[PDB]
């Protein structure tokens, strides 16, 4: 009995940082599953949820795993039956677990040798902040020896842009970091925009970092296409109503109440404070009419109605 | 004699910082014209030409500056005549020159008397960073006791949002800073969008700090109105074709050359350095199709053809 699976989850991040957070969760559940010794089907699903939720609430109720955790459950729940030997249950169960992990680990690869030809000779690409998805495909393209250049949004408040350029610069790729306020000015140059994904919705929506829809309309207005890479285990069952209807933990964009009683053209270091920042949101949502093609291990999906057929296929 | 007239211009900033830059240059030109023992018409215009350019070349080749100075001349020489008394020239010049600056610095007030009713009770306004005119109208509105509350774009790289924030909060009105990456998520909550002007071109376009166009597209797509406050002496003869072709000093948005070597969620300290920040532009341009209303000392102009007719009426 581990009784602290989060550590195994955590330990995975140090045994390998090159894996996504949900991947560790599943890789941890199997360790729970394999070691768990039960006697009823209900016993498994009881601690499984009570393990997933235990794993959920530990990580600020992150969405990426919250999908993967729920999808994984509803996966093994499918072709589950108990005939004669009870041990057959666990057998069919955990064996499919590794089988799911197999596809899960190979998912972020399957998109690479599938989205790399989207880059053409001498083309110029744009990316909002770092994402493990857009990275490999570019590298799996640059590996093929193809000339191209790339801008990267600085991606406040994450600042993941400063890391993304390095990962590309290190891989022999020309970069040019650009402020979040100057993406529109860049659309004239760019031939194709490309971002990762943090969550795909029932309507084909796109929950990713805070500024995706900021540039999604630009490419829509600047007539350049829009592409986003999303692994299967990022489909979610929610369904918003706009670019705003999302549940968010901390309340956002509150105002202050000012009682009548109180007190170089580039002015660096004159910004908001950390307290001012966290009032601002963290995630974004681009309605499907603004994306022209999802990039998944299941392939490239453009209808953003078939995503539901695929989403229905993913769940029961 | 009259030399380093920039210090006159400069001492004005210490004599008064609440006035902008172009008014100071004008205040210096008339001062230059005042102590100008001249004898021929050619001498006068030869001075201010070889005077304004020295004034022009001294400050970034700023637009609002280069706007007023060039406009100042082509005003004074308009109704110019020489008859008998040569002193009439210097008389007619400074007398009319005084009338200009008199009308000039009074413009920023005249705008407030027009913009304040544009704010409704309980309205929600949006402004991209600091903007002289935007402040006064809101203040002159708040003086008249009206409930509302505004967001503020932090305005990278200028960071002028915090300055705009305080100056509003300092005048007891609610504020809430917004990083430039997440303006779109806030639009559904707004009822009006109001930004300043750093320069106005012929076609009705807008030259303001970078990210100004970043907003107007949202206001367009989010079906929210867009107003910009501009003083007359900011009009310019420039006519950019697209939303990009504008004269810019330094090279902008260049890339690197990664030869084969090897050099090596509120992450608040991995930010683009001053060098790579410089590679970003400081100005964007809002096409006239997005300006629902343009408010000036001459009034409010929505035609964006009368922008030009009033413009032609300025350049004699």
From Swiss-Prot, chain B:
This is Translation initiation factor eIF2B subunit alpha. Keywords: Cytoplasm, Initiation factor, Protein biosynthesis. Belongs to the eIF-2B alpha/beta/delta subunits family. Its main location: cytoplasm. Gene3D superfamilies: Translation initiation factor eif-2b, domain 2, Translation initiation factor eIF-2B, N-terminal domain. InterPro entries: eIF2B_alpha/beta/delta, elF-2B_alpha_N, IF-2B-related, IF_2B-like_C, NagB/RpiA_transferase-like. Component of the translation initiation factor 2B (eIF2B) complex which is a heterodecamer of two sets of five different subunits: alpha, beta, gamma, delta and epsilon. Subunits alpha, beta and delta comprise a regulatory subcomplex and subunits epsilon and gamma comprise a catalytic subcomplex. Within the complex, the hexameric regulatory complex resides at the center, with the two heterodimeric catalytic subcomplexes bound on opposite sides. GO terms for biological process: cytoplasmic translational initiation; negative regulation of TORC1 signaling; translational initiation. GO terms for cellular component: cytosol; eukaryotic translation initiation factor 2B complex. The keyword Chloroplast does not apply. It comes from Schizosaccharomyces pombe (strain 972 / ATCC 24843). Acts as a component of the translation initiation factor 2B (eIF2B) complex, which catalyzes the exchange of GDP for GTP on the eukaryotic initiation factor 2 (eIF2) complex gamma subunit. Its guanine nucleotide exchange factor activity is repressed when bound to eIF2 complex phosphorylated on the alpha subunit, thereby limiting the amount of methionyl-initiator methionine tRNA available to the ribosome and consequently global translation is repressed. One of its GO terms (molecular function) is translation initiation factor activity. It is found in: Cytoplasm, Cytosol. It comes from the Eukaryota. Pfam families: IF-2B.
């Amino acid at each position: 009995g581990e009784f602290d699976i989060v550590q195994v989850y955590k330990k995975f991040l140090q045994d390998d940082p090159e894996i996504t957070m949900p991947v560790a969760a599943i890789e941890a559940l199997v360790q729970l599953l394999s070691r768990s010794q039960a006697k009823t089907i209900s016993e498994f699903m009881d601690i499984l949820q009570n393990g997933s939720n235990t794993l959920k609430e530990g990580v600020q109720n992150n969405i990426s795993l919250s999908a993967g955790c729920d999808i994984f459950q509803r996966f093994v729940t499918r072709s589950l039956h108990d005939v004669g030997d009870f041990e057959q249950c666990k057998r069919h169960l955990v064996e499919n677990g590794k089988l799911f992990i197999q596809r899960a680990r190979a998912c972020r690869q399957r998109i690479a040798h599938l989205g790399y030809p989207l880059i053409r000779d001498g083309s110029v690409i744009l990316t909002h902040g770092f994402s493990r998805g857009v990275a490999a495909v570019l590298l799996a393209a640059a590996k093929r020896h193809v000339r191209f250049k790339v801008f990267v949004t600085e991606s406040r408040p994450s600042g993941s842009g400063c890391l993304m350029t390095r990962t590309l610069k290190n891989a022999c790729i020309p970069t040019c970091m650009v402020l979040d306020s100057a993406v529109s000015f860049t659309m004239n140059r760019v031939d194709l925009v490309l971002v990762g994904a943090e969550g795909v919705v029932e309507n084909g929506g796109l929950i990713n970092q805070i500024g995706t829809f900021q540039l999604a309309v630009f490419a829509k207005h600047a007539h350049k296409p829009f592409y986003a890479v999303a692994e299967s285990h990022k489909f979610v069952r929610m369904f918003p109503l706009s670019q705003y209807d999302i549940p968010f933990s901390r309340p956002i964009l509150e105002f202050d109440d000012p009682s009548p009683e109180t007190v170089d053209a580039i002015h660096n270091e004159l910004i908001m404070n950390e307290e001012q920042i966290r009032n601002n949101p963290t995630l974004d949502v681009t309605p499907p009419e603004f994306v022209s093609g999802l990039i998944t291990d299941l392939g490239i999906i453009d209808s953003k109605s078939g995503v539901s057929e695929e989403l229905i296929k993913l769940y029961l």
